């Protein structure tokens, strides 16, 4: 039952299995498979409505980008700057630079560096040749500086389908589209977002592990004011069960997406994403939409994500009232010690 | 230095000491004496301004009531109803009946009973004669149903002095005057109030032990939604150091007030009040005033009482958001476990 990503799919034309289990990293928790369905399947529509993950296999969402690759992109993406993160580890933990001032003791294991696409491809080539071990991960928002061919492809996306989704779910508006190009083995540590997300795979394969919002207690996100706000503090590769006991109770939903698949990552859902080992570079483009407007009057019982919204707000409010985020913890502890625990 | 109430004062006319140490209960913590000064003393004015306790010995605040006693009162107090609490223990822990619905597992050790003053005096006499052990504690707000003589005495209070205090401190308005008549040995467990208080002693002696607002961490008040909100959970007679470790660090300010003394109990300051053992009945009247208006913009650092105000508000807000006070604790714990502790 906890088969994880399940039996590796077979590529059309008897071209062998898309990937093999040995390309997946090993973790201490169990996982059940996310449903892989057709966009016409009533079940898929039902899952999206109930804000549950589902992998759509035939949306043609980014059909025009399926031909994208380093060469093509380096020739039509433009001369604008691209944010490229560098790290000596496979884990690319995200951090908010604007919050780094309130936590001077935080030392990022990955550094950001702006550059031209051709510079990224060059540095990428420079690594593979010398047999180096430093990893790179480009993460840039698609802006107005992209070439005409890329703009053409963008226009070719299936807006008719996604726009209807946006409408049917009452979502806000598309805030952005993140272009992700990473090296094999690259990993983005578990975290959650405050936006709805359609994750469109273009090149290579990615293993995606999601956890429902009700697993907040097992994932121990960093303090809201910390640079790693929304990210899990647990090191999936070496879980500290003394500090994070409940991580022993965590249960995820996983899947492996490839060219053409679109994974719906519901808002507030935690997700860990890794590029398959020895699977080559990977390319992805996401679609981040604002969630629907918060209800007029709340109905009880309250949903897990609503409680998460409340905790986040309490932390933010306390940080402003106390006039200093480092004082949030001492006040919270004083409130509960001997009173609520 | 931690002399507590200090050397027992000598009553004028060589009438012996007002009281002796053997009349004070024994506690596990140390205490320093509260200053006993003259209302004309600049130091007394300074203490009240800085919201620090002080015992005023010559305000003549309730001069006309100094002649009050059970007989006099039973003859001029009126036929209105008086709230009388009954308990089989010396501790009269206060509880909010309106919050008893959200905590059905709370069983009060004291019961309230309305009756006429003459009924209270009768029941009081009925106890002393039969040698019973049940204790009584009358606590009634002075209303419009009091006799003309009592009203006369009320008018004779030193309003010129207290009204100037109210004005000088910018306090709100007098909300009420509580009449307290208790039996020797009676104890009101430690708690704090959200109003400024001038505590006017009339008959008998009371030992008052106060703790600054910054001792919140050592006193473990009950949850805000619990009936005993603002009261300490620690049983002063048998401190549970496992649940309340920091009560081992508590340090109080104490004093013994008698006829004519007025104790200023600053807002937010914790106070434990006990009628001296074998000291006879005691009579007191308080003056509860609303505190000054909360500042426009807060200045940092924040005062201890302001942090207490914040914690209380967080608890209240959470109780309303979650739509159920019993859910406050689980949410608070989820917020800090593995994140702030």
């Amino acid at each position: 039952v906890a088969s994880g990503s399940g039996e590796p799919r077979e590529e059309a034309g008897a071209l062998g299995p898309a990937w093999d289990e040995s390309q997946l990293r090993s973790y201490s928790f169990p996982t059940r498979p996310i449903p892989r369905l057709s966009q016409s399947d009533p079940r898929a529509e039902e899952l999206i409505e109930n804000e549950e993950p589902v992998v759509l296999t035939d949306t043609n969402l980014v059909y025009p980008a399926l031909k994208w690759d380093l060469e093509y992109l380096q020739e039509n993406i433009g001369n604008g700057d691209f944010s490229v993160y560098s790290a000596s580890t496979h884990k690319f933990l995200y951090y908010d630079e604007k919050k780094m001032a309130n936590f001077q003791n935080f030392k990022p294991r990955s550094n950001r560096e702006e550059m031209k696409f051709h510079e990224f491809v060059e540095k990428l080539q420079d690594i593979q040749q010398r047999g180096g071990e430093e990893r790179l991960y480009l993460q840039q928002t698609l802006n107005d500086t992209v070439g005409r061919k890329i703009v053409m492809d963008f226009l070719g996306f299936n807006w008719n389908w996604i726009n209807k989704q946006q409408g049917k779910r009452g979502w806000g508006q598309l805030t952005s589209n993140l272009l992700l190009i990473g090296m094999e083995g690259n990993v983005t540590p578990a975290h959650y977002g405050e936006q709805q997300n359609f994750f469109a795979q273009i090149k290579g394969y990615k293993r995606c592990i999601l956890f429902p919002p009700d697993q907040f207690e097992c994932l121990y996100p960093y303090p809201v004011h910390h640079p790693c706000d929304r990210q899990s503090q647990v090191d999936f590769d070496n879980p500290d069960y003394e500090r994070f006991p409940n991580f022993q109770n965590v249960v995820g939903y996983e899947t492996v997406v490839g060219p053409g698949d679109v994974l719906y990552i519901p808002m507030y859902w935690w997700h860990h994403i890794e590029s398959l080992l020895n699977g080559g570079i990977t390319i992805t483009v996401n679609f981040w939409y604002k969630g629907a407007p918060t209800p007029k009057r709340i109905e009880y019982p309250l949903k897990a994500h609503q409680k998460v919204a409340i905790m986040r707000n309490i932390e933010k409010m306390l940080g402003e009232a106390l006039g200093n985020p480092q004082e949030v913890g001492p006040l919270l502890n004083t409130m509960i010690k001997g009173r609520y625990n | 230095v931690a002399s507590g109430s200090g050397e027992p004062r000598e009553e004028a006319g060589a009438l012996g000491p007002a009281w002796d140490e053997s009349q004070l209960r024994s506690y596990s913590f140390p205490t320093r004496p509260i200053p006993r000064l003259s209302q004309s003393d600049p130091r007394a004015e300074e203490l009240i301004e800085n919201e620090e306790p002080v015992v005023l010995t010559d305000t003549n605040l309730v001069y006309p009531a100094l002649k009050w006693d059970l007989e006099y009162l039973q003859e001029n107090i009126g036929n209105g109803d008086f709230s009388v609490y009954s308990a089989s223990t010396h501790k009269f822990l206060y509880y909010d009946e309106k919050k008893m619905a959200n905590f059905q597992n709370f069983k009060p050790r004291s019961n309230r009973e309305e009756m006429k003053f003459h009924e209270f005096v009768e029941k009081l006499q009925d106890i002393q004669q039969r040698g019973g052990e049940e204790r009584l504690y009358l606590q009634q707000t002075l209303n419009d149903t009091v006799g003309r003589k009592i009203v006369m005495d009320f008018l004779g209070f030193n309003w010129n002095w207290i009204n100037k205090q109210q004005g000088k401190r910018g306090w709100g308005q007098l909300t009420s005057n509580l009449l307290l008549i208790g039996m020797e040995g009676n104890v009101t467990p430690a708690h704090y109030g959200e109003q400024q208080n001038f505590f006017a002693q009339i008959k008998g002696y009371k030992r008052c032990i106060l703790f600054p607002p910054d001792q919140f961490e050592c006193l473990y008040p009950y949850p805000v939604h619990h009936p005993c909100d603002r009261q300490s959970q620690v049983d002063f007679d048998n401190p549970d150091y496992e649940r309340f470790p920091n009560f081992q660090n508590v340090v109080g300010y104490e004093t013994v007030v008698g006829p004519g003394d007025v104790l200023y109990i600053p807002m937010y300051w914790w106070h434990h009040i006990e009628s001296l053992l074998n000291g006879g009945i005691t009579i007191t009247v308080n003056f509860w005033y609303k505190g000054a208006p909360t500042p426009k913009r807060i200045e940092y650092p924040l005062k201890a009482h302001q942090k207490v105000a914040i914690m209380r508000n967080i608890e209240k807000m959470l109780g309303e958001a979650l739509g159920n006070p019993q859910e406050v604790g689980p949410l608070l714990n989820t917020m800090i476990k593995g994140r702030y502790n």
């Binding site: 944010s83 993460q139 405050e194 709340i298 309250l302 707000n313 309490i314 | -």
Partner: peptide, 13 residues
């Protein structure tokens, strides 16, 4: 409005 939320994600606003 304690259930209100923002729209932060793993990308610069």
């Amino acid at each position: 409005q304690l259930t209100s939320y923002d729209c932060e994600v793993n990308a610069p606003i």
